[PDB]
Write a protein that binds this ligand. Structure first.
Ligand SMILES: O=C1c2ccccc2N[C@@H](c2ccccc2F)N1c1ccccc1
Ligand SMILES: O=C1c2ccccc2N[C@@H](c2ccccc2F)N1c1ccccc1
Length: 148
């Protein structure tokens, strides 16, 4: 049990994802929204998203979260997995987080390559999100996607 380990757990303990939504970055229109804390490690979350999203050049994400702990460099590593193989990857940086703050994080997400159809993908995709303060691994969460 290292000091780094202990810190990560404290950051996790104080971390909460409050709400999120996703939008076509052209229409600016809602594809998905929720208040389920999809960041929660150790369970497979499920999420229903519209087949239409696969057709988007890019997706805009708004994400609201709280943190009792201060973070130097708060960032995510995300991966699409399809039947256990990684198709795509992203790195996003929020940076500095003030202790006891609530914050709304806007990102833009681009698809790199050709999409298999929804019917093939549905229930076979997992999105893995790793939450880091700099080099420190705080949490790893998984979401399975059904396309509807
Ligand atoms: O950014 C997120 C996200 C953020 C916090 C926690 C889990 C996340 N997983 C996915 C995501 C977002 C919205 C709905 C389902 C979903 F799996 N996700 C996402 C959306 C698009 C591309 C990659 C990851
Ligand atoms: O399901 C996918 C997806 C499926 C196969 C290959 C890459 C994927 N990445 C994202 C996604 C889809 C469409 C446009 C951008 C994008 F990042 N994506 C997605 C959609 C909703 C929420 C999170 C990720």
């Amino acid at each position: 049990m290292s000091a780094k380990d202990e810190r990560a757990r404290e950051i996790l303990r104080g971390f909460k994802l409050n709400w999120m939504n996703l939008r076509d970055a052209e229409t600016g229109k809602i594809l998905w929204q929720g208040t389920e804390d999809l960041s929660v490690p150790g369970v497979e979350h499920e999420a229903r998203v519209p087949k239409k999203i696969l057709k988007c050049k890019a997706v805009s994400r708004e994400l609201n979260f709280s943190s009792t702990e201060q973070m130097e460099k708060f960032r995510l590593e995300q991966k699409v997995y399809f039947k256990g193989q990684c198709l795509e990857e992203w790195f996003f940086e929020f940076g500095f987080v003030i202790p006891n703050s609530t914050n709304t994080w806007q990102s833009l997400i681009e698809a790199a390559s050709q999409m298999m159809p929804a019917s093939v993908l549905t229930g076979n995709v997992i999105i893995e999100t790793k939450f880091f303060d700099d080099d420190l691994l705080v949490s790893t969460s998984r979401v399975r996607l059904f396309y509807v």
